[PDB]
Each structure stands twice: as C-alpha cells, then as structure tokens.
Write a protein that binds this ligand. Sequence first.
Ligand code: HEM
Ligand code: HEM
Ligand code: HEM
Ligand code: HEM
Lengths: 141, 141, 146, 146
Amino acid sequence: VLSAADKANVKAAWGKVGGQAGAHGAEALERMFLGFPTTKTYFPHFNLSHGSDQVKAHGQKVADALTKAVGHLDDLPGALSALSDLHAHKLRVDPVNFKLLSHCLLVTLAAHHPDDFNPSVHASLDKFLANVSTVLTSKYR
Amino acid sequence: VLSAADKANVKAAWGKVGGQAGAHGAEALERMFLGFPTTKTYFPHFNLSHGSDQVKAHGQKVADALTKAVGHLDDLPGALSALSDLHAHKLRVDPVNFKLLSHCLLVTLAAHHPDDFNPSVHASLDKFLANVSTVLTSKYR
Amino acid sequence: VHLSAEEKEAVLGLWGKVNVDEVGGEALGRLLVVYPWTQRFFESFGDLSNADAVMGNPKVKAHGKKVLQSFSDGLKHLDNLKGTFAKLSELHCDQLHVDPENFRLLGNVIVVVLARRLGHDFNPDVQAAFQKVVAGVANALAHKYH
Amino acid sequence: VHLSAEEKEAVLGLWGKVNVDEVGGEALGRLLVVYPWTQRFFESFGDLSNADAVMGNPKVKAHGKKVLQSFSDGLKHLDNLKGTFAKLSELHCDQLHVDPENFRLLGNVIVVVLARRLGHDFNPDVQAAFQKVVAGVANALAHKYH
Ligand code: HEM
Ligand code: HEM
Ligand code: HEM
Ligand code: HEM
C-alpha cells in the first residue's frame, strides 16, 4: 500500500522526471516488446520498431496515465476507471503483463536517473506500479 | 471490487459449508504441507503428519478467520485488523504461500461439495480469497 | 519428473478413474470462467459470456478433451516430459503467445476438477504426487520459448 | 536457455565492465529492502528495519559478492546451467527452503542494478539478452524440487 513515505517518494521522484516522462514511457514499452515477445501480440497494428510514430505516440500516453495517478495516489480507482475497463474487459490484457511493463519502467527510470533512485524510491516505486496495476486489474468481472 | 453476485455466492457457499468449516481449515493445511513442503517451515513447533490435534486446532482458527471476512465483505481490512500485521511484519510470510493455501482450500471445498461448487461459485470464492490475501499481505509496507 | 515408486502408482492409479471426455471439458470451461483474460486466445469458439455458455459450448468440450488426451499421453512418459511436449511448446510459444504462467493455472484447475469428481479418492497424498506432475507439464510446455 | 550468437557477446562483453562486487552487494541489499518478506532468510544478519542499515550492513555485501560470483561463474556455462547449480539448488530446496518465485525476483533486481550501473549502454537489446540468462539461472536453481 502507498503510505505517506511512499506517496512523497513517488511525487518527489516523478516530479524530477519532468518532460522526459514521454521518452521513458516509450522506452519501457520498447524494452518490454523485446525482453518479453509474448507481449507483442497485444499490438499487431503498431510498427513495433525502434521508434515509429506509434511506440512514442503510445509511450506519450502511458506516461500521462501515470502522471494522473501520481497526482491522485490518494484515490486511484475513480481516477483510473476507464483504462481498467479497457484492459479488463475490452482488451482482456493478461494480468501478468502489467508485471513485465512495470519492471521495464523501473529499468528505464533507473538507467536515466540513477541518483534519485535510492532503495526507498525503488521500493516505493514498486508499489505505485503495483497498486496502479491492481487497479487496472479489477474490472475483469 | 466484489460484484453483488460474488458477495452472495461467497455467503452461500461458505454458509452451506456451515459446521464443516473448521475441518476444512485443517484439511487445507495438510494438503498444503504435503503439496508444497516449502511451507512447513513456518510450522516447525507443530507436528503435521495427519489429523494431529495441532493442525486440527490451527485449522479451526483458520476457518473462523474466513467466517469473519465472509461476514465483513465490505470492510475486509478492519475485519482482519491484526491478522495482516501478524502476517506481513512479523512472521514475514512469503506471498506465494497465500496462493498455495487458497487453491488447497478451494480443492477441499470441491472434494466435499461437488454438489454445489458450480463454475460461478468457484470463480467468486477465488476472488474472495485473492482479496483476503492482499489484505494479509498489504501491511508489507 | 522426480516421482518415487509410491507417488507413481498413485497418479496412474488415479487416471484410470478419470473420465477424460468429462474432465477435459469442465477444466477448460472453468479456466475460461475463473480467469476471463484467458478467453482471448480462443474467442473464435463462439458465444462465451456466462458459466453456461462456456460450459455448454460444444467446441470447449472437444478441445478440452484433446488437452486431457495430451495430459494423458504425457503421463504415460513422466521420465521424459520435455521430449514429449517439445512440439506443443513452440505451438503455444510461437503460434499462441500464451504466458507460461497460464499453463500452471490450467494445471491447477485440473486438480480442482479431479477433486470435484473423485472426492475422497483424491486424498492429500495423491494430490501432492499430482501437483508435481502439473509442474512437470508446465515447465515442459514452457521449454521451446522465444 | 538459448541465447543467440550475438546475444552471447552483448552479455559477455558488459559483464566485463560491471564491478560484480558492488553489484552483488546492491542487488541483495536492494532485494531485501524491496521484497521485505525475504529478510526472514537472513535473520542472522542483524538489523534490517531501516533501508540505510540494510544498505550498509557488512553481511549483505559479503554475501551479495557471493551471489553475483556464482552468477558469473555460471555465465559462459550457459547451455548447461542445470549442471552448474545442482548442489546449489539442493541446498536451496532442502537446506534453505526457498521458494523459486524468489529467484525470478532476484534476477529481476540484479537486472535493474546493472541498468543503474552501465546506464545508457544498457540498451533494450542488451536487457533482452540478460533477461533470458537471468531466467536460465532462475529456472536452473528451481530444478531439484517437487
Ligand atoms: C502502467 C500500466 C499501463 C498503463 C497506465 C497503460 C495505459 C494505457 C493507455 C493510456 C491507453 C490508451 C488510451 C487512449 O488511447 O485513450 C492504453 C491502451 C492499451 N494498452 Fe495499456 N497501459 C498499461 C499497461 C498495458 C499493458 C501491460 C499492456 C499489454 C502489453 C497494455 C496494452 C495496451 C493495448 C492493447 C492498448 C490498446 C490501445 C490502442 O490500440 O491504442 N497496456 N494503455
Ligand atoms: C489466508 C488465510 C489465512 C488466514 C485467514 C490465516 C489465519 C491465521 C490464524 C487465525 C492464525 C491463528 C492466530 C492466533 O494465534 O490467533 C494464524 C497464525 C499463523 N499463520 Fe495464518 N492465516 C492464513 C494463511 C497463512 C499462511 C499462507 C501461512 C503459511 C505459510 C500461515 C502461517 C501462520 C503461522 C505460523 C501462524 C501462527 C502459529 C501459531 O501460533 O499457531 N498462515 N493464521
Ligand atoms: C496442459 C497444457 C496445455 C496443453 C496440453 C495444450 C494442448 C492443446 C492442443 C492439442 C491444442 C491444439 C493445437 C493446434 O494444433 O492448434 C491446443 C490449442 C490451443 N491452446 Fe492449449 N494446451 C495447453 C494449455 C493451454 C493454455 C494454458 C492456454 C491458454 C489460453 C492454451 C491456449 C490454446 C489455444 C489458443 C489454442 C488454439 C485454438 C484452436 O486451435 O482452436 N492452451 N491446446
Ligand atoms: C538468483 C539466484 C540466486 C543465486 C545465484 C544464489 C546463490 C547462492 C550462493 C552462491 C550461496 C552459497 C551458499 C553455499 O553453497 O554455501 C547462497 C546462499 C544462500 N542464499 Fe542464495 N542465491 C539466489 C537466490 C536466493 C534468494 C532470492 C534467497 C532468499 C530470499 C536466497 C537465500 C540464501 C541464503 C539464506 C543463503 C545462506 C546464507 C548463510 O547461511 O550465510 N538466495 N545463495
């Protein structure tokens, strides 16, 4: 659960990311498709290469859902209703893919900002992505 | 995020078990200690060969714990108040052991209630337990 | 897999009591019901949107038995599972793109089915022997991965 | 596992520029702070109640160095990682009673530390090469089980 330390650890870490949010949301995806091919099926319509309008257009979006969450940690469910019904109903995005997308986002943040990323920010950021995931993995019915 | 259905099936299925619940808490633990031996290390002070007064006593405490949650479906965190802290920050129970204790509790119910263990009830009891699990493993942080 | 003389007589002692036509369809039906996301890889198999539609879906029952017939043949060769399951692995890996995790869920749903239908004859011990085998089939199918 | 002939160099190459000593102390320490429930296997290491204390504790370092030493003295022996971790899994199963889920967790942890280390040179394709290796160890170590 995101406690106060966790909340302030995320905000204070994401805030730093700044404008790169988009380049890092995309890198992660791009790292996912490569590190775990079994996720490439969820996108037979993208140009899935080292960046084609798609992966960065998509990355740009993933980067915004997180910024919304990061700004509403206190109550994610309401502020995450849509996506949850897009992944747990319409798309039936297999639950364990949120686990492989979080990882890559951690390997992405960590490669670019290795000085804010202390063990606590890590532990703290492994719970954001976890409780964002769980949220997007409710709707299922 | 339990639909109104699950709340009913869970209350009925548990409700049909009635008296038997205790006996099930135990059966569920034997099937666990023998199916997933890695879990026996939390119970070294115990003797767990088969139907020994110890598993039989822990088992009733396990069934009673679920009887309360089944009865406090709306506020699970409070209902469990101390079982979570007693699980996470203390015995430090690995989270997979919850996953193995849910499927062996489910398997018990089926062996004993093939009559009323339709796929729907099976799906709803599965959620009830995943739900009871996050709780016991939420206070990890 | 590492199955001892007793463990082995138990498992095979138990398949003879399993009606494959029946089991395979209830397990795969319960899979599609308990873990919704799994339905995707299927979809084509018709109207799936309630316990009744998946249970009753004819094709779910046919496929469900091929699945068990494989689990059957596999059982007949516990000593060299990987080899047996080789061909089926790049089928789920390349062709299907099924996260190897789902292979254990299915395995663990077959166990809940052997119980629902074999009752007392699925004592704690026999189930343990069988839980092994399930891992064996899961790790087996999760071989030729890429 | 089966890395390619190009992936073999991606890894072998940058393992030579990573001070496995520090990495080993950062992975193990980073695990314990992130996955708290594993502190239960290292209770003879003293105090681990605060992130700082853990990432300072001399015991974690001395052991980390050992963890990554076998990771490395296991690298290159890729096609037979099963014959390199044998007793080492026996020890984990029988002696330590670790659950194999935790080996996938650690391989993941080490894989992020590396990123913090080689930074920009840890390009996506390299991650995907290490990703398969860490799975190979992760599944090799889970070998002698039940
Ligand atoms: C960190 C968690 C995730 C976030 C917050 C995220 C966010 C989003 C967003 C914002 C959209 C686009 C909605 C729009 O166009 O208005 C979306 C759609 C989608 N996501 Fe995710 N996603 C996550 C995880 C995943 C995972 C793990 C997969 C599977 C690999 C996935 C697969 C897709 C697919 C199939 C779509 C289709 C969208 C399209 O075709 O444009 N997402 N996601
Ligand atoms: C998810 C269902 C579970 C519930 C609802 C639950 C409930 C209980 C209950 C009621 C007790 C008795 C506590 C007391 O002394 O009053 C307890 C204690 C404990 N639990 Fe669990 N538990 C669950 C799962 C687990 C798992 C997965 C493990 C095993 C890996 C575990 C290991 C223990 C141990 C060792 C103790 C205390 C030993 C003793 O003093 O009797 N529990 N649990
Ligand atoms: C016990 C493990 C499994 C065995 C024995 C197995 C076996 C089978 C067999 C014999 C086929 C026919 C393949 C063909 O020629 O197309 C099949 C197809 C398939 N399996 Fe499984 N399978 C296993 C687990 C699963 C799981 C976990 C999923 C996940 C959803 C899955 C998804 C599918 C799909 C998508 C097809 C193709 C659909 C079709 O042919 O109509 N299988 N399976
Ligand atoms: C990624 C795979 C891992 C590798 C390569 C690894 C390797 C090792 C090695 C090299 C030793 C040498 C001990 C000996 O043979 O005398 C060891 C000991 C040990 N490992 Fe690991 N390990 C791994 C994962 C884990 C995990 C994640 C845990 C538990 C959460 C764990 C807990 C331990 C403990 C407690 C010891 C003994 C410490 C002592 O008594 O001083 N290992 N491991």
